[PDB]
Amino acid sequence: DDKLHSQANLMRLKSDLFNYPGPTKDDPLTVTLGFTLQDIVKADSSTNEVDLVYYEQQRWKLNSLMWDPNEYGNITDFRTSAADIWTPDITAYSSTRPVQVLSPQIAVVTHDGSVMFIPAQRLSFMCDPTGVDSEEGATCAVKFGSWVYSGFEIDLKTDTDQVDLSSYYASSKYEILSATQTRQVQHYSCCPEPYIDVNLVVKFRE
Amino acid sequence: KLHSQANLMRLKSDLFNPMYPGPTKDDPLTVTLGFTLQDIVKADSSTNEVDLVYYEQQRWKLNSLMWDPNEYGNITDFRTSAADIWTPDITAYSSTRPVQVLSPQIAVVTHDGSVMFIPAQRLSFMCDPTGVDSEEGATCAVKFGSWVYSGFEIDLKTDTDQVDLSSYYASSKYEILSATQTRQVQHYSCCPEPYIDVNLVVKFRE
Amino acid sequence: DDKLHSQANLMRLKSDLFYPGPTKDDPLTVTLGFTLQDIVKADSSTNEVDLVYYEQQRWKLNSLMWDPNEYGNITDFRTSAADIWTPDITAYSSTRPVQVLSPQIAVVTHDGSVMFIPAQRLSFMCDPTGVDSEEGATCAVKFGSWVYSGFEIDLKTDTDQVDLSSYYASSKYEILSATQTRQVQHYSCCPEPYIDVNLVVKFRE
Amino acid sequence: YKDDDDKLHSQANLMRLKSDLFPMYPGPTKDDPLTVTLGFTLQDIVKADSSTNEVDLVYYEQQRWKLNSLMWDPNEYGNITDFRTSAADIWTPDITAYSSTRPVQVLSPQIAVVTHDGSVMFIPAQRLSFMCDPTGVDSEEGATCAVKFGSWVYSGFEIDLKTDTDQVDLSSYYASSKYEILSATQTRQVQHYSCCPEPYIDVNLVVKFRER
Amino acid sequence: KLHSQANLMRLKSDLFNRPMYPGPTKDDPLTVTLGFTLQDIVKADSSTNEVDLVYYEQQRWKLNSLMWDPNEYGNITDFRTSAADIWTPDITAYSSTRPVQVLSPQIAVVTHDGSVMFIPAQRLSFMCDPTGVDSEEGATCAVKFGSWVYSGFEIDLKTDTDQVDLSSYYASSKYEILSATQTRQVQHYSCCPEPYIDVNLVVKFRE
Ligand SMILES: C[N@+]1(CCc2ccccc2)[C@@H]2CC[C@H]1C[C@H](n1cc(Cn3c4ccccc4c4ccccc43)nn1)C2
Fold first, then answer.
1. Where, in this chain's numbering, is Mg(2+) 2 bound (chain B) (predicted)?
2. DSSP letters of chain E?
3. Which of A30, B36, C138, E27 is geometrically suited to a Cys-Cys bond with B164, CB 3.0 to 4.6 A?
């Protein structure tokens, strides 16, 4: 009965929350982004493509997802399918293959309205690995950002400019020399609204 | 702020509630098409296939998607999944693999009824790269157009005949010597009505 | 108002129109034709060949007939191929799942004709020995219904000559000839005859 | 007009049959077990990969079973004796290759033929990569490989798996294959594990082949 | 026989209309037992340090909400159901380099005490340096499996043994197995007061 009780309290919370159209200029949203780089799998010098495996941490906060734990049996967080909630359209801008998702698509929602979503991904992107067989290595970069929302609708932030490297694969064919993730504001001539991306820059060698 | 979210939900609800059944000879449609070439990833002379990554910009305008911003809290635009609305069946005529989609598929609808849809794609198509190792380079071409709508239903237009190369990957294995996109009208033995395509012609070398 | 009127006539038509497939009492004729675009690849290590082609399919249902005069003079419309019955026509010696290159949309006309032309890439069983010679190599593949006999689905072509007017002029392979021949198979097992179209292609580097 | 009405009449009778056929069958059980007959038609050995010991087969897998819940009297349904239906509309057995190395690839539509006595015939074409050492294929004696097929989750108390013959049908084998078949058999096997009182049934496909 | 089918359908209707199970929580936690049956090391790629494994992954858990008295249901003790019809754990490989490939139907066995048995066959590419596979000591690689979003306070992981089942290992694989273990690990992250659990698969092999 106590188990049924706690299950009922969670079902009641989720039912209440699921009964938000995305950010707008009137209701903008900040998304925090961070990369945990696991592996440089392949560097292909015949096509100038490089394959990364990483965890992409995304976090945003919505008033529509807030609740008072006292009103819901002291539940402070829950797990739901990422398809049950809005998620940002953050995309690599210079990929050469569809990203491959390696993990279940499940987000964690906290009572303050906070959402954490961390998909693991394999990405092929445009990168000339010339010099990777040298001491100074090779340098490659790829920008991530919303596909359809400007800086007036989604702002992008990092908690740090240092890519988390504490899970990089120790026996990779490639050693990481540096890995940074840097927010950039762009002003294009096409458009008066600013655009935001996070630039991932990785220096590596064999 | 719940007010602005409610205004956007009211607009979307009004718009989604005659449904637009696609264009016809009595209600024809003009689709504007343009390419922004990012990369020639691979040119395979053993099979005469070449792989291209590009943005394909598509734009059209529908009365049924118009609204007065005054009646909807001055909302001027919104975002919706491309699967939630009619989109044109623009197709490469001479691909050799199903096109790969590299971006979210989200359209931007604006209050004048116009729709902007810009998928990023990777495409393999029939292309003989003989001469790519020479100064004159190699020239290839591929037509894009509606698969099943004639020019009396979907007409195509370009805003320029010059393919934008400013996002072309500077360290590609191949450099672009020229890239044009040209509207064509074609009649076919099969079918009584002309079909419209845009011919994408690219000249490139190592 | 005029554009809303025509959109409403189309939606009324589609609504009114929206069959358990064919049977021996209610049989169906499918017309089939091939437009061969490219022999992409001829793999002598596995005796597989990859073709790219348009496959014209056409059939007629009384259940999709209408009088244009009752529907604002509409003579035809477009609809998703997953919204209507389509025949189970299949290559009999493929070695990979066919790859679909075109959107799956059919044309329907007021006489009840359905018209469907998927672009496709097909790997199929083919020994290319001889392709590096003047006589070339020759390969064949049969197309037909998977589960319907000739008493349920009859296959017809409009001609035995494959359409080569869109063959890729710079292919690695040149086409010496390409034919698409209706065949009636009579088996002793079964009272019903079976029907395929045999696609025969002779080609060389 | 009369012809039109005859056509609609037969259509209505078939729609009535399928609507009538569709207590729902919940799959087989120890109380209501089921026999599934399995036979293979080998079309082609496409590829033998000696660097990974994987071999690729194209074949038709014939499956047959009979359900009381699919019977009907043709007299009650306009003399209809059989119909075609998508394999997703009915229960189908979970017959699986036990040592595949890639997901099976389906090459044909997934359509079953249901006959008025309740017998179902389902013949999908498939491409399968499975574990196989091709050492000897470049010799006159050839190489021999095997793969077991069986239900993934039903024991012999729920699904009895049978063959009609040990002889794999080779009459459609591709005459210009890179590999010629020396023999191919399909044999029912019963395993008992001491863990569990229930038997477990597979059909073992054994193929001996060599470079052409 | 119609009566036994109606009993099974009655049971399945009663279980699937029960409040709905929302997944495990701190207050309603769950233990998942994991075990691997290793069939084949298909491929070891030294140019990318990726290795491909084929295995069966046994998963077992128990839910109050799937319990029933066989006496109320014609002595039915178990049934088969699609894995999409029940809650299943988000068990994931932490260092794969391609999406896992599923080789078996996604069907589970549910038992009257509420236990679920689900055993997918899988092909997995994961991060592994095969240097030494050409030698007598062989090479050694490891990959963790665990929930993707659930802590040890919601999903505990157990193995029934630490010895990977090698009884179905392919005898003519390009590679032989020197040893293979599956070890529960308790993992503490500075982010979080709750422990995280994984099962570490360690395989030593050689040509
Ligand atoms: C290249 N298209 C194809 C070219 C083609 C096409 C047939 C051979 C050889 C190159 C795409 C591309 C644009 C132009 C023609 C387009 N198109 C759309 C359709 C639909 N359609 C049919 C389909 C099957 C059978 C008959 C018809 C039919 C009859 C009248 C009007 C339209 C028809 N047919 N062709 C298809």
1. 77, 153
2. -HHHHHHHHHHHHHHHT-------BTTB-EEEEEEEEEEEEEEEETTTTEEEEEEEEEEEEEEEEEE--GGGGTT--EEEEEGGGS----EEETTBSSPPEE-S--EEEEETEEEEEE--EEEEEEE---TTTTSSS-EEEEEEEEESS--TTTEEEEES-SB-B-TT--TT-SSEEEEEEEEEEEE--TT-SS-EEEEEEEEEEE-
3. B36
Ligand 1 pocket: which of B146, B154, B188, B193 to mutate (most atoms <8 Å of CB)? B188
Tell me: is residue C102 an annotated ligand-binding position.
no
Torsion of CA E82, E86, E89, E91, to 10 degrees: 20
Domain around B94: 1-206
Cα–Cα distance for residue pair A186/A193, rounded to 1 Å: 9
Residue of A nearest to B73 (CA): A26
Q: Which residue of E has its CA nearest to A171?
A: E129
3-state SS assignment for residue A118:
coil
Establish whether C186 is an annotated binding residue.
Answer: yes
Residue B195 to residues A145, B59, B94, B146, B148, Cα–Cα distance (Å): 37, 18, 15, 8, 9
Question: E strands, chain B, where?
Answer: 29-44, 49-66, 77-81, 90-92, 100-101, 106-110, 112-117, 120-126, 138-146, 154-157, 175-186, 195-205
Beta carbons within 10 angstroms of residue B146's beta carbon: 24
C-alpha to C-alpha distance for D139 and D63, rounded to whole angstroms? 34
DSSP percent split of chain D into helix, strand, coil, nearest 5: 15, 50, 40
Q: Tell me, using a 6 A CB cutoff, whether residue B67 lines ligand 1.
A: no
| Residue A19 CB partners (closer than 8 Å, separation 6+) | none
Among candidates C118, C119, C131, which has minimal Cα distance to C49?
C131
Cβ pair C23:D46 closer than 8 A: no
- Check B95 against C7: CB less than 8 A apart: no
* Residue B52, strand partner residues: B40, B123
**Helix or strand holding residue D148 (H, E):** strand D143-151
| Residue D126 identity (one-letter amino acid) | Q
By C-alpha distance, which of D192, D172, D186 is closest to D63? D186
Assign residue D44 the CATH number of its domain.
2.70.170.10
- Structural domain count of chain A: 1
Q: How far is D109 from chain C (nearest CA, A)?
A: 6
CB contacts of E128 in chain A (<8 Å) are 171
The DSSP secondary-structure symbol of A99 reads P
CB distance B3 to B9 below 8 Å: no
Give, in degrees to the nearest 5, the angle at Cα B185 between B183 and B187: 155
Method: X-ray
Chains near B with 3+ CB pairs less than 8 A apart are A, C
